[PDB]
């Protein structure tokens, strides 16, 4: 009695997902007015149905939240047994503080909505905040992407085991050190004061960037040439959400990446059509386990240490 | 004590609100992320204040009501006093019920959004149903329009004594009946065979006022505006009080027989208005300007109505 | 696991969905004071079951609210597995908009207590307005009598291919051009001013008064003489709910109706007693497949164009 | 700023509280539809204003929780500042547990309706149990009536120095005890074998006082009495803050051997008092007055108690 | 699919319990501070799971509170299916009414704390007043002692066709009448005002004392010699929770008591030790039944009035 | 209008408070029954007043926690305005994420019992987290003791004009970055291997500055020091906003090589110190009474960061 529906027209990522799931997205009927006013139907009964809504990769932010908002209260008042949203990449993730600024945390008014509008459950990988699981009451299954990453690693870099991790800025401390413990490597941070500091050794080693997304890329391109100028042999970039938006794909054309890699918790064809340095690991098996395990009510703890 | 925000670069009704209640526009810094990320920031203390955002007119349903979202967000926990979001036009109001199918009731989705963003009141204009006030538990004050329609029809058109409101479609036939029963004239409705439209009523020889709370494409009230002059209407009008004139409506009016187009200020028009001559605005800023200052004072708003 | 209950003593209703279902009405000692204090006390353990309590019909609409209320509290803390409303007449329907005036939108007030009562999902037939259902944030299945009706139609109705469909109303425009487009015939509008207008071709044809409910019937009652005065054949009122309360039946017996049509989502048997214009046409079936499905996940929609 | 409201047609309560505070209710339009559907219209603005609806005391308790529900909701939808329910006689009090059965907590149930139907403040007298109050999340004043009580014992029982307070059951326990320690007197229970009575502690040969939150049939209060005579008691008196005097009450007092009866005014008792001499009436239409002003002045409450 | 926890280190109550269900407790991997700080760590999957958390016995009663919230926590952001708390002496119930003062009702602040911890069920036993279920808004089992302590009187009083039950104070008296009626025997009711009034016949009966709960002692030891002044044969004491903190051990060793009873909801092996007249009737039986018949969604009613 | 009361025997803190806003605390009776269940009664009304709650710092963090729930509780059903809790060091604030394993996220539950407690507004210091400000829907003021930690670093340490800010782990890099970015000088940061500790970021021959939100057993702080030494650093200085002292601390401190431990006045300090000379506690008591001040005055908090 599972059912799994696919935010828009992006049914890439949801139809891997329902494709290893032996699976077929349901059917929704979309309207899309004007004013990108969207009006939704669910095409088949979901009554007493355990249901996964994947958010798209539309690209305008707003509009999939308020279609993903959408679907999830046209389930529930249509009786789905439950309602879980499969959220890849976390919307106004970053937007989870104040700062010391009159601003909105964001991040939880999006967690509020999803409640509201119906969400029984979040699974969602690599949060920019773990702390953003405490913006909702229902569970989150935050998944993360280090085992494929640390996979990816040993099985794409020859120096691997004499590598340094680098977080590209201070709040990345933990991430980095937790993957260089792993691989029982070297770590070392950038932050940025417009100059940036460097700390951790690098010289004659090769580095990788490791971080949680990367959106204009300004910041991965200038710690790469800080990187280099530092002494590392090459550098990558390693990131599991790739928003690559506004130049970013012009700027890591130019950049001295040996290459940069992201999931596909966002898609990445096009950007790849224009961007050669670029190269994805698949997340879906991750996702789809994911999913599977929800629904049979077994342990998805299994795939944060394990590539299904 | 009052203070008074604008979304989005739309700030010609804001600015028009603000200056009739002698107040400017509060401060906010807007930088509009990647994917259109919303990114909002209020730029003074609002901290113990009667907080008053407008909402923006710029086309774009999402990024607007999401704006919307965050400046009350902000707002509330930035402690304001209390945060009324003033919505000219109810987004996804059209949306407010299943109608057989396993549709959303965005309208109420919505509703809930703003509530759990921390709105404590809501100000509006013609919700396109009066049920939809009961999708809150705060409070919601649906002003009217009608007034100043009324008002204009009596002063624009010289054979308005014996004119025919008309309704473009079946669910509209309480909004007509209650104008030409105001005006003291004939109603008649207009349906699409569920397709060939069907008039009952009468409007032979007699000017035709179409009357609708919305219109966006205007296919619907363009056709509806033939089907009149083939069942030998005078001349066809056609009032709205939101005019989100998107897509092929800009020139379906122009290319239609409408002796004009009258609108209100609700949703921005000059740039419309540039490539259409025959649309009015009527505008509503001193209305809702009057709602948020006897909403402020504690004044009795119904007499707006 | 299902366990259906009656609100009071109009097992009547109740008693034919149960019979439908295979079942017995749950056992329920009550008790009323003299102030109609409603004390409830279920007589069977509902401890994880599916449980369904179809409102009265005692005509005290206070005292069946609260009963009702009561039954549903009850059942929750007596952990219910789920507790489903079934109201055939959803109670202060009618006052669901302020329409211009400082007014209590009741139908809302009354959707927040049965939420708060315990109620989980709500079962109704015909509510006033559509909009209703966006006074719950729970689940609300509104099964339409059209199917019936339109069933009813053409099977007493020999004129049915040339006759109109009348709404009482402006605001019933809608319902009416829904049944004339299902039948390929005209339809035709009553609007009150104290004077009606009429609108739409009636002459020499058979006029059907169709609309959600009818009460003291001085509505109906007018639109029929202004119907004939129009040179009507004959005419028919067909209501969902029938209330029929005040002079209602009076006004029918003096009336010109060829007959008046109900369902019986109200008990009708001591009115038919006393008006023979009345006719009932019997809706336990569609309430006891609506309540089977929901209880095995199935279909309901099924039921908004199929007379089961 | 402040507004009050009464429910029902019932005003004498509601007027005797108006007059103290030098006011006048509030105006309300009520059309009782068929099946007594409550229809309410507040007849003027309480935008912003300190509302407060007294209950109805119309015998019919689901017609009165309802029209007080309907009420808080329309003046909550009007933008009422804040709304207090004021409920002398809380409704379904007496079924506030489960007692061992598959029983609904109905006190609970209509805490949460008038919760949700958005009372902000509660002000009650004698609730049948104090731990209602917890039922709510919102601020709840339950006044008393034992000193009024007290005061009439003292002013009208010239043994009362040696008066036995006697409890018509077993729960009444705690009452009788504060009324007899107060008084510095015995105190006696009665119990129905679960029937024959039984009777624990002194009345030999002097005055007995029934004491009870409440009476609504009184065959428990009167066939106490008869236990009490029988017990060797002087004279026997009842008194209850709550005469829901309903069914064979309005006799079964008269043909009983009580030297009198004395209630509240928390329910309308000239009806009644009519029918029957020995009724006494304690008016607290003072108390509730006295904690609404203090209720809407900040002042203190408890001085009352 | 059955998960039962112990709150902390007192497995005592808890591990009788799992041992009468055929299971072992699940595994929790806890922390304590300097501060007392307790972090917790579920040790297995809960996930689709019926959880049953069992409140400990540390004496501490805020330590234990906070345990208890927080391990339903953990359980309900780990997905558990269901979170039930097993409360056998519900914490802060004395404090239930404000009793003309402007005090916390700290029982109801209790419970809504239980709520937002996500508590979906309580399981209890005699509830220091009945109303504390209305403290709630979901369901709560409140379990009685009353048919053990039935049982144990006929066991172990051969007088017991002609002995007194004794109320130690006025909000006692249902409680008392209700087990006398049972038994066919008087009641008594003892009142403070500092000096104790008793009302009822005790006179040459053997008088037995019962309550809910007993911690000072101060007030049933003074009533154990009011009794025996009143002419009672000899005087026992039965109370279901035996708080027994501050000189209470030292007032029933002096005290004359033929016996103190109470039941094991909370632990009683150490003040044993130093308190031979302490006699205990194990409760887990009925704890263990209650939680089998909550999974299974059978009758827990079975319970009230009969012993496993 | 304002009142201010205090948790356990704790009031150091709280009489500071009281004392810059010219006030004296409210009376409360705080009566400790057996199992150390907590009792509390407010002293005095508070009917319609603005009422901040400080936080007891008497190390039992269950107690303390209880005690403040639930005199927020007394408060809000005593009609209280409004309740701000005031809570220097938050209760489970490093609980505040699963961290890849089956824990609670404490600090959320905290936030919602607070929440449901009744409280209206927090006030804090330096929480382990902004992100926790997210875990509540009610506004939350999150002060910082930076300015005052900055100062104190100007004027104590002669070479802070080219010391090193240094973080004991991983976590705090934000922190000693910012701090590091404001003096114009290098950060450090150290990470146990997962141990051995290792050392990124320049401190031979210069002062070294340790800085963290908080510090319990100082094992952590301790090791960091001698790593600090051993890798050249002149002399080590250890600053932490919370002195959660407890255990080992006391000390470990002693025995550790460190110039100075600096910590606020966020937890009673004076037990400590004298078992500890080089302790030296900044006061942010006035900080505490200026935010209570403003947010009484609706004036802007935010100045105080």
Redesign the interface.
């Known amino acids: 009695?599972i059912k799994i529906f696919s935010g828009s027209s992006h049914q890439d990522l949801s139809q891997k997902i329902a494709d290893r799931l032996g699976l077929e997205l349901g059917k929704v009927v979309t309207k899309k007015?004007?004013?990108?006013?969207?009006?939704?139907?669910?095409?088949?009964?979901?009554?007493?149905?355990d249901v996964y809504i994947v958010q798209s990769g539309c690209?305008?932010?707003?509009?999939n939240?308020?279609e993903l908002?959408?679907?999830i209260?046209?389930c529930?008042?249509?009786?789905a047994?439950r309602v879980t949203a499969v959220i890849p990449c976390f919307?106004?993730a970053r937007?989870?503080?104040?700062?010391?600024?009159?601003?909105?945390?964001?991040?939880?008014?999006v967690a509020?909505?999803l409640?509201?509008?119906?969400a029984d459950?979040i699974i969602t990988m690599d949060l920019h905040?773990?702390?953003?699981?405490?913006?909702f009451?229902i569970?989150?299954?935050?998944l993360?992407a280090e085992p494929a990453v640390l996979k990816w690693i040993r099985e794409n870099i020859s120096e691997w085991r004499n590598c340094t991790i680098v977080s590209p800025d201070?709040?990345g401390?933990?991430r980095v050190?937790s993957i260089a413990?792993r691989l029982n490597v070297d770590?070392?941070?950038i932050?940025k004061?417009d100059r940036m500091?460097l700390?951790?050794?690098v010289k004659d080693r090769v580095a990788i960037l490791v971080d949680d997304m990367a959106?204009?890329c300004g910041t991965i391109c200038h710690a790469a040439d800080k990187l280099l100028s530092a002494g590392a042999t090459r550098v990558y970039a390693i990131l599991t959400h790739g928003?690559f938006?506004?130049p970013a794909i012009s700027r890591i054309n130019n950049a001295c990446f040996e290459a940069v890699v992201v999931t596909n918790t966002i898609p990445q064809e096009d950007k790849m059509k224009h961007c050669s340095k670029i190269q994805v690991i698949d997340i879906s098996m991750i996702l789809a386990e994911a999913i599977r395990?929800?629904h049979?009510?077994?342990?998805?703890?299994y795939l944060?240490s394990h590539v299904p």
């Open positions: 009695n007015f004007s004013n990108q006013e969207t009006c939704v139907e669910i095409g088949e009964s979901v009554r007493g149905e690209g305008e932010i707003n509009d939240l308020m908002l959408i679907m209260n046209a529930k008042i249509a009786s047994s919307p106004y937007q989870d503080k104040k700062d010391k600024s009159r601003a909105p945390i964001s991040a939880k008014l509020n909505m409640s509201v509008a119906g459950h905040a773990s702390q953003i699981q405490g913006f009451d569970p989150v299954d935050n993360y201070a709040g401390a933990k050190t413990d770590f070392a941070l932050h004061e500091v700390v951790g050794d959106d204009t928003i938006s506004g395990r929800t049979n009510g077994e342990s998805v703890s944060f």
